[model samples]
Target: MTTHGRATHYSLGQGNTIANGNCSMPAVPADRMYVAVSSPEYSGAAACGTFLDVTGPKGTVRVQVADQCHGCEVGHLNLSEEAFRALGDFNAGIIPISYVTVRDPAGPTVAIRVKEGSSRWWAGLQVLNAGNRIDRVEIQAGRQWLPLTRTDYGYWVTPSPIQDGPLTVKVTDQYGRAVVLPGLRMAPGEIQRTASRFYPVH
Candidate 1:
């Protein structure tokens, strides 16, 4: 059951946040709780007083939220050790995050830029650990779904080999919701560019 070389993490968390790392917060009753689903493991789950079920591209994960995170008022999800691996980010330290409360439902925005003269395209991915969990990112070229990272807000360097025309990027947010961008076309020999600001993830 080990997917060694094929494991894909959508985002990475730093685990240094006081709210996220501090395991002293009071537990809340969570029958209708929210979490940031990751791979088979490493997703955030609170075990106050309810059951946790996490669905993914390949499967679903179920756990309990042992503490409370008011930050996830909107879509804040804490991760398990296994779920963190799903994030796949190795940067250790404090990361920023929020929640999906009535006020902050989403986190910071992501940006992408195509450097001039470089065959490789650069995408500035934004994963505000403060907002909702991103399921996957799908890229398209001229109506075809190009093979790209399922996780969003992360940098994508290689110019998608799929082609260079009418690229459509789609991102899956938490709760199986989707955030799709408009159609994008690239020059035959030039990389495209895009950018946006986003919160930090720990």
Candidate 2:
């Protein structure tokens, strides 16, 4: 579905140092375009890691949802300066735009990273390169699957500590497709790439 919105620009510094916004994902290269979505669209960071194809007067730019535009109203996008420039004239300040969610079939496989402060008793995990919006994440605790709570900053956290790894994880996408990854260790700050990815849906 295509959504109509207004697009504005923001600076992320000389080298885009603050590129890792609320999503907490690793920053993309300087030339990569990104955008911050409005609150409703951000869906408490559910929009993070998703891609959008935005069309403006000049052209369309494919950008990743990297942050929350707290000041923007519904249907507004605060694009990175580079993204805004790719869409239209910077002097215009803002421009009308239409966007649609996109999937990158050739993107990297899904990866799971244990948050820095996590331990056996409490855990926080971030999913990377999901290729689509993730609906939920769960960790297998013996015979049961415990759902993790997603924070606004993009981490799926557990209310209590889980069993010692290697752990089994299930990641479900908005389209209901799921991938199960087993043998993930609770190695904080380390990114463990899975051999699977959510296949693109029509």
Candidate 3:
């Protein structure tokens, strides 16, 4: 996971910003932690919400990918204000750095949020802080796990919602690693951190 980069702290004075990366949540939503990786290294949103261990002249600090750097290349990382200061001086502007893809290091567990206005006919779900890029999601139905379609809006949707309250979701990553999360609810905007990850931090 040795990757090249430069880091920039942007929009801290703007008062508000959006988390437009693959996570699709508009912003990090009160987590107050965020980052934006260069498109080449972004893996087309696959890097979204994943932790990055950025090493700079000052030291190494972790940042979550919440957006993308349009003008940046493979070796560039545009971090938030606090994240930039974590590894180097803000006056440094841009400096040579290396970042490694790490699992959810100091963050909460994976958060599965049910989108607003979802109903029994159609359920919208988003998997956040998955620790890695997730490719597919399945819901347990009648002893069988039914696949949920991944949409461009970053939601894993079901053709028909299952009944009841708490449920289980089966998540699979791009690397083929999978995990089952039980006791999940169709609660919109709820941050449910499960006990497992598709991959381990190394």
lDDT winner = 2
Clashes of each: 41, 1, 3
Candidate 3 local lDDT, 1-202, one digit each (tens): 6987677777434333332554576455353456776776666566665677888888887777767777877777788777777777889798788988875455445678788777656787888767777787888887887788876456778977686767789888767878889998777766677887655545
Clashing pairs in 3: 5-75, 19-26, 19-27
Q: What lDDT score goes with residue 144 in model 3?
A: 85
Which should have the higher TM-score, number 1 or number 2?
2
TM-scores for all candidates?
Answer: 0.32, 0.91, 0.78
Model 3 worst lDDT window (10 residues): 11-20
Global fold similarity of model 1 (TM-score): 0.32
Once fitted onto the true fold, the runs of candidate 2 whose alpha carbons sit more than 4 angstroms away are: 14-19, 103-105, 200-202
lDDT of 2 by residue, 1-103 (tens): 8899899998554443322777876655357688889889999999988988999998998888888889999879999888899999999999999999896
Q: How do the candidates rank by TM-score, highest first?
A: 2, 3, 1
RMSD for each of the candidates: 15.2, 2.3, 3.5
Model 1: residues with Cα > 4 Å off, grouped in runs: 1-130, 150-153, 156-160, 183-202
Judged by TM-score, which candidate is best? Answer: 2
Q: Tens digit of lDDT per residue, candidate 1, span 1-202?
A: 2211122222223332212222211222122233332322223321221234434333444433334434343233554545433333424322233211221233335433332233325332222222344555566656665444422222233335545455566655545655555555443323233343223333
lDDT for model 3 comes to 0.72
Question: Candidate 1, 15: how far from true, in Å?
Answer: 19
